[PDB]
Amino acid sequence: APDEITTAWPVNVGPLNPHLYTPNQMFAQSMVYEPLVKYQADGSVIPWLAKSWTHSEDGKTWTFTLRDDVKFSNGEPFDAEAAAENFRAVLDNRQRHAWLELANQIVDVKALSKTELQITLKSAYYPFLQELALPRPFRFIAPSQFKNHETMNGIKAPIGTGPWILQESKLNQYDVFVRNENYWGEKPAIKKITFNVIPDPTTRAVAFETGDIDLLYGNEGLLPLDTFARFSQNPAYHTQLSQPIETVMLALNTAKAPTNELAVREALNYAVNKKSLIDNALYGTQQVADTLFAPSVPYANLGLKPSQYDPQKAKALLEKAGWTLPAGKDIREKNGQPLRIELSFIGTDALSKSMAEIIQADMRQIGADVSLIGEEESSIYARQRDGRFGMIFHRTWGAPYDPHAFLSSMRVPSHADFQAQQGLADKPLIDKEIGEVLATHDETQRQALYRDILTRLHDEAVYLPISYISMMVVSKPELGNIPYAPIATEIPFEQIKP
Ligand SMILES: O=C(O)CN(CCN(CC(=O)O)CC(=O)O)CC(=O)O
Ligand SMILES: [Fe+3]
């Protein structure tokens, strides 16, 4: 069947509530649900469910003109009432969306007619349109499928306007999607997509080698990277590696001994041989990261000075800070206290473990004792939210989140970044400036504020950037060239064209 494919995902796609997070998978929410405006790789948006829009001079009131020809997959019309009901349903759960500042800025949403939708904002929020473009939460389910006139407590059928329809889901086995034959836009070439639930990366590679699946698409965790490199040379297969999409880093706890000392954080940022780490654990497949955001990220080409691998310098910094080696020991001490740092990661994630072992080795060579704390996912996320870590693996979010949304979220205390930053004298100023940068319409001031925030974060050595990672593809050749989505968390199945 040349227009049916089988792929894999580590978990089910979830219930496909458009307005909720885990266990809903973003790429799948994006398959069914659509936005008012669609994000493009150049950073702009184009008309989508909204054909056009205007705003007020003060930038607080926006009026969208909607398409008039869009139906939900169940035949019900998409109109301004439906869109307004969705916004209400999202904002009824406002607390859950704190990380996204548009959810705090929207003050009112109302359908002025079937085709006119008015959105009012607290302030002149510059990332407005890009945040409407996101996979979640501002996309649209048929209001008939609300439960008790809400979505925050669940939905009935996951009815969107999008090019794919969920056919069926079987927990821990598979999810099947079919093409929407009444889609308002271009019809996908592919008719059916089956997602086999395959949690282990090795098991995913095996499934591809046996012919059980036709396509694997995902980030650096998709399959073992040595196997990837092998497949890349195998003439029976097709593989791809995108340009980098986001940063993988450690976050260092500025509020916990001994990472509360700037000098210790500086030393750590000279201690890791990142090129080696990438060649060893990532099989040469990713790029070295010197800064939180790659220089290609909007607002982030700042000429920030890299801390290159330099164990001599790391040891000098620590000696100067009073962290010195006792007679016959390899671990430094200050005030009888050992230089001991806990590194938390997801313990069943083989790649993270491999990286953690490398980081531990490199840091031992400069007299820091890194203890590896590998735990289940829920325990790691809990550590991130409450700052119970020394160092922790973390990542940025990709386009169109990076940098404005990721920075916005640094203000939210129940996220790793806030927690890592909590010990900085200038954290309140950073948070103030993050608030300002998002509202400011003076473009000169906006660049200054991004420079200031990112520069403080860099100079304070809050992070240990490791790698700018890429999306990876393995496919049967008959599927052809597999496109990448502008939005880093989306999978553009509708663009596959054998
Ligand atoms: O996952 C969440 O609950 C919310 N996200 C907000 C950022 N997300 C977008 C999302 O979940 O909608 C980025 C991402 O998950 O890549 C927090 C996080 O991932 O750290
Ligand atoms: Fe998220």
UniProtKB/Swiss-Prot annotation:
Q: Which organism is it from?
A: Escherichia coli (strain K12)
GO molecular function terms listed in the Swiss-Prot or TrEMBL record: heme binding; metal cluster binding; nickel cation binding; peptide transmembrane transporter activity; transition metal ion binding
Top-level lineage group: Bacteria
What the protein does comes down to: Involved in a nickel transport system, probably represents the nickel binder.
Q: List the disulfide bonds.
A: none
The UniProt family comment states: Belongs to the bacterial solute-binding protein 5 family.
Its keywords, alphabetically, are: Nickel, Periplasm, Signal, Transport
> Where does the record place it?
Periplasm
Q: From the Swiss-Prot or TrEMBL record, give the protein name.
A: Nickel-binding periplasmic protein
Q: Which GO terms describe its cellular component?
A: ATP-binding cassette (ABC) transporter complex, substrate-binding subunit-containing; membrane; outer membrane-bounded periplasmic space; periplasmic space
**What Pfam families would the database entry show?**
SBP_bac_5
InterPro entries reported in the protein's UniProt record? CntA-like, Peptide/Ni-bd, SBP_5, SBP_5_CS, SBP_5_dom
Instruction: Offer one example of a GO biological process linked to this entry.
Output: nickel cation transport
| PROSITE patterns, alphabetized | SBP_BACTERIAL_5
